[PDB]
């Protein structure tokens, strides 16, 4: 029972050469190079799934900082004031109000100002 | 237990330990796969690196040429070289214990009775050794794929069933585990039941 490898090796090489679409040079048309590119892209995607949640909280904090300082309070005092006032709105929403509802944010900064004072 | 006879409407008594025991799928399977293994001819062979035609001259010197070292034109790595683990003619037959082969048949016969696939007749033959005869005989009995077990090998019945693909005519001593399962229905003459009664004991 001799087994020929032509059909299944063709499909296994095509399987990851399709995953290497858009890569530069041999990384998108040469199997040996494309396998390393596909594996490395898998390692990067796994770790950037976990540091996408950091890069976005950094963005939210920086925007809450910028908006709070326009209302006369820093980020650190703003968050501390919100905890004292028992406001559970998180950074994703706080940074959303800061951009799309300027009146609500300043009505929300005054909530933290009263809690601290 | 007893088996009803379609031909004569009488009854025939048989041992419960032969035609009435539980099905042993694990045991029946081993005997069946060991029957198919004994049908293998097992005649085949490839050439090792010692049997490929060619000389033992080293293709190129050990060092200095810049090529990967080689020692034989017949290395299995090379094309037109030897096969690494080239096969030999081998015997694939397995040993089946006597108490298992008989034990497997008893489970097969018992399961045929439970599935209404074993039918017993008083006698089964054809007047002339003509294939058209038992072809008509089996239409009357409403049988298409059938194995006929006869007490004595009937020459007319053997010749008249030879050209029918879905019909097999044996004798009570020519019963095998595979053919009992491989056929839709099994027809045993009352003489044949007695012989397998005293063969399977």
């Amino acid at each position: 029972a001799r087994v020929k490898r032509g059909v299944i090796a063709r499909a296994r090489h095509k399987k990851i050469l399709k995953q290497a679409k858009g890569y530069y040079g041999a990384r998108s048309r040469v199997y040996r190079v494309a396998f390393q590119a596909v594996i490395k892209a898998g390692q990067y995607a796994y770790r950037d799934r976990r540091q996408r949640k950091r890069q976005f909280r950094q963005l939210w904090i920086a925007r809450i900082n910028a908006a709070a300082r326009q209302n006369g309070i820093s980020y650190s005092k703003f968050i501390n004031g919100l905890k004292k006032a028992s406001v559970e709105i998180d950074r994703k929403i706080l940074a959303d109000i800061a951009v799309f509802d300027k009146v609500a944010f300043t009505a929300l900064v005054e909530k933290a100002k009263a809690a601290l004072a | 237990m007893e088996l009803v006879l379609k031909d004569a409407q009488s009854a025939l008594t048989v041992s419960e330990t032969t035609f009435g025991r539980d099905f042993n799928e694990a045991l029946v399977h081993q005997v069946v796969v060991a029957y198919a293994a004994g049908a293998r001819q097992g005649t085949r062979a490839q050439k090792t690196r010692a049997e490929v035609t060619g000389s033992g001259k080293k293709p190129w010197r050990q060092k200095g040429t810049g090529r990967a070292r080689s020692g034989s034109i017949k290395s299995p790595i090379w094309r037109s070289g030897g096969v690494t683990f080239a096969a030999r003619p081998q015997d694939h037959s397995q040993k089946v214990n006597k108490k298992m082969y008989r034990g497997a048949l008893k489970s097969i016969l018992s399961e045929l009775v439970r599935q209404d696939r074993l039918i017993v007749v008083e006698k089964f033959s054809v007047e002339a050794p003509k294939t058209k005869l038992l072809a008509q005989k089996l239409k009357d009995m409403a049988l298409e794929d059938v194995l006929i077990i006869t007490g004595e090998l009937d020459e007319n019945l053997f010749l008249a069933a030879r050209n029918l693909h879905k019909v097999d005519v044996r004798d009570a001593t020519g019963i095998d585990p595979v053919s009992l399962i491989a056929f839709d229905k099994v027809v045993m003459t009352a003489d044949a039941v007695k012989q397998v009664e005293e063969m399977l004991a």
Binding site: - | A26, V28, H29, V32, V33, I108, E111, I181
Partner: protein
């Protein structure tokens, strides 16, 4: 029961150990052999009893005894084997005909193993003290 519906018992057809067929199989690369030893070579491995050059156990211990040719032609007979004979005579010849002792055994001894429940006569076979009591307790008799 069809030829394509009968299957083996659960756990009776353990699959073989395929060695060196990728990372995921757990047996790829070295194939259970480790790295860079004599035991990892094709055909490598030390013989039986070799201990690295230290005098092996089967050579630093002394030989003892001799093989007795009389024990090769002497057998032992159990009480449960006395009923296997035909005719109620447990002699040296009636005991080979029952396939109890080898065809070339010349001395047999009946020991207390099993039990005697029928009267038998034992000619020419040595009988232990325990077996003599049991043979005579079943109505049998022992003859020199």
């Amino acid at each position: 029961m069809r030829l394509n519906t009968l299957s083996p018992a659960e756990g009776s057809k353990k699959a073989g150990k395929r060695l060196g067929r990728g990372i995921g199989s757990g047996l790829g690369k070295t194939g259970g052999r480790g790295h860079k030893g004599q035991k990892s070579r094709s055909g490598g491995g030390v013989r039986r009893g070799f201990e690295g050059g230290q005098m092996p156990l089967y050579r630093r211990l002394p030989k003892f005894g001799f093989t007795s040719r009389k024990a090769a032609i002497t057998a032992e007979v159990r009480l449960s084997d006395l009923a296997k004979v035909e005719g109620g005579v447990v002699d040296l010849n009636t005991l080979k005909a029952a396939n109890i002792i080898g065809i070339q055994i010349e001395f047999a001894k009946v020991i207390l193993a099993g039990e005697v429940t029928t009267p038998v006569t034992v000619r020419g076979l040595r009988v232990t003290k325990g077996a003599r009591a049991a043979i005579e307790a079943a109505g049998g008799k022992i003859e020199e």
